[PDB]
Amino acid sequence: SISRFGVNTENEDHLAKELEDLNKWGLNIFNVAGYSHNRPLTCIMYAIFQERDLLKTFRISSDTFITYMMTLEDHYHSDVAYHNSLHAADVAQSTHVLLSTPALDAVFTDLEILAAIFAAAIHDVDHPGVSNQFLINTNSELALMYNDESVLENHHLAVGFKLLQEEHCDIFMNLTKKQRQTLRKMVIDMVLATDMSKHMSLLADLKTMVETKKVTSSGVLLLDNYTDRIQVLRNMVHCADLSNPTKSLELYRQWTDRIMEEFFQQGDKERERGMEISPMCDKHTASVEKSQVGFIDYIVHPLWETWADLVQPDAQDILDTLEDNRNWYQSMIPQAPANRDCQGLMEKFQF
Ligand SMILES: [As]
Ligand SMILES: [As]
Ligand SMILES: [As]
Ligand SMILES: [Mg+2]
Ligand SMILES: [Zn+2]
């Protein structure tokens, strides 16, 4: 209901224009946030669920859905530069687009589609704007609870599911016990997979799958067993999570400005607490351009190249944009002279 969003007819008309790109890679989620009183995750998720008739299929009332989504979205930190609800909204919408790629047509069940989009929506909830290592190094209660392993990722999941218990928030109330068990299994799998420390293993497994790749007479992929389906889904969400460099430059630049701002803020916290500054977190040493080029060359491109292979020729335009964006950043490198976590990777592979 538009009233729950507090949007007037004028901005509702603006949103109607923006949402024409709901099923497109070119959707501008920044504009959606601007016309929805900064509730891009709830707005885009509502639009997605309506578009896919998910509310109908799973007997989720608009009331329960919006209440839960607004609750979830409010648990993202609006003062965190990158890992906020705008990023979650972007990953959710990007996942929604990837799910409809021709090569995957009719491959996934409605429960798997629900699980993937839900996973994308909650994958960074209650993110503090600092890395797992920062939490571990400060002897954070969170790190102690999760034994220093995928600390934030485990937390995002715990929060995402815990919020279903708040008043009028159980969007899975009408799923069968079996469906809830299966969806929960898949969501946990996908969110845990967003831990950048698992990237290399994910890509390797994905490549191994592309080898045994099977298609139909029309070209559609064939995934008849659960293990292969969840493997594609976990990589799909991971790709959506790493899709910023594949969007139009106007968007990509904003995403980059944001992640750097977030890294710099962690750097400020480290300096404030007498800690050594983490890689990429010192604005007076960080090479933004070099870092993006290196990150694309060693992490993003390899991943998307593999995904494109799996769904060829579906993701060709994405690869072209990624290439153009990479070369733009390489050109922007101030005319100069001659680990296993995002921050460490960006510093290591720095071009
Ligand atoms: As909306
Ligand atoms: As991320
Ligand atoms: As990252
Ligand atoms: Mg994350
Ligand atoms: Zn993310």
Q: What angle do CA 347, 98, 174 make, to 5 degrees?
A: 115
Say how far apart CA 203 and CA 85 lie, in whole Å: 26
Say how far apart CA 175 and CA 11 lie, in whole Å: 35
Q: Enter the DSSP assignment of 58.
A: T
Query: CA torsion angle for 192, 70, 131, 123 (degrees, to 10)?
Result: 20
Instruction: Say which residue the tokens 């559609």 belong to.
Output: 220
Question: Considering every ligand atom, which ligand is closest to the CA of 121?
Answer: 5
How many angstroms is it from 81 CA to the middle of ligand 5? 12
How many angstroms is it from 214 CA to the middle of ligand 2? 30
Instruction: Say which residue the tokens 């501008």 belong to.
Output: 28
Say how far apart CA 331 and CA 292 lie, in whole Å: 12
124 is in an annotated binding site: yes
Question: Considering every ligand atom, which ligand is closest to the CA of 156?
Answer: 4
* DSSP line for 169-237: --TTTTS-HHHHHHHHHHHHHHHHTT-GGGHHHHHHHHHHHHHS--B-TTS-B---SHHHHHHHHHHHH
123 is in an annotated binding site: yes
- How far from 349 is each of 32, 266, 294, 295, CA to CA, in Å? 34, 20, 5, 6
Would you say the CB of residue 196 lies under 6 angstroms from ligand 3? Answer: yes
Q: Give all domains of the chain, ordered by start, each with its CATH number.
A: 1-351 (1.10.1300.10)
Would you say the CB of residue 299 lies under 6 angstroms from ligand 3? Answer: no
Structure tokens belonging to residue 262: 């977030």
Say how far apart CA 131 and CA 185 lie, in whole Å: 25
Instruction: Say which residue the tokens 């709901």 belong to.
Output: 22
Structure tokens belonging to residue 278: 């983490």
Would you say the CB of residue 91 lies under 6 angstroms from ligand 3? Answer: no
> What's phi and psi for 221, nearest 5 deg?
-65, 150
By alpha-carbon position, which residue is closest to atom 1 of ligand 3? 342
Question: Considering every ligand atom, which ligand is closest to the CA of 194?
Answer: 4
Q: Enter the DSSP assignment of 261.
A: H
How many angstroms is it from 91 CA to the middle of ligand 2? 10
Active-site hit among 14, 77, 83, 238: 83
Q: What method did the depositors use to determine the structure?
A: X-ray
Decide: 75 and 162 in contact? Cβ < 8 Å. Answer: no
- How far from 189 is each of 185, 208, 237, CA to CA, in Å? 6, 19, 11
Say how far apart CA 349 and CA 351 lie, in whole Å: 6
C-alpha count within 13 angstroms, C-beta hemisphere, residue 27: 29
How many angstroms is it from 41 CA to the middle of ligand 5? 13
User: Quick one: resolution in A?
Assistant: 1.8
241 is in an annotated binding site: yes
Say how far apart CA 343 and CA 351 lie, in whole Å: 14
By alpha-carbon position, which residue is closest to atom 1 of ligand 1? 43
Give residue 168's identity as a one-letter amino acid code.
H
Say how far apart CA 78 and CA 80 lie, in whole Å: 6
Q: Is 155 a catalytic residue?
A: no
Q: How many residues does the chain have?
A: 351
Say how far apart CA 115 and CA 190 lie, in whole Å: 9
Say how far apart CA 216 and CA 279 lie, in whole Å: 46
Beta strand extents in the chain (DSSP E only): none
Give the binding-site residues of ligand 1, using a 6 Å CB cut-off.
Answer: 5, 15, 36, 43, 46-47
Would you say the CB of residue 342 lies under 6 angstroms from ligand 3? Answer: yes
295 is in an annotated binding site: yes
Which residues contact residue 1 at a Cβ distance below 8 angstroms, ignoring those fewer than 6 apart?
62, 66
* CA neighbor of 318 nearest in space, from 296, 338, 298, 340: 296
Decide: 254 and 77 in contact? Cβ < 8 Å. Answer: no
Say how far apart CA 313 and CA 103 lie, in whole Å: 9
Query: CA torsion angle for 83, 84, 87, 92 (degrees, to 10)?
Result: 120
> What's phi and psi for 247, nearest 5 deg?
-95, 165
How many angstroms is it from 343 CA to the middle of ligand 3? 7
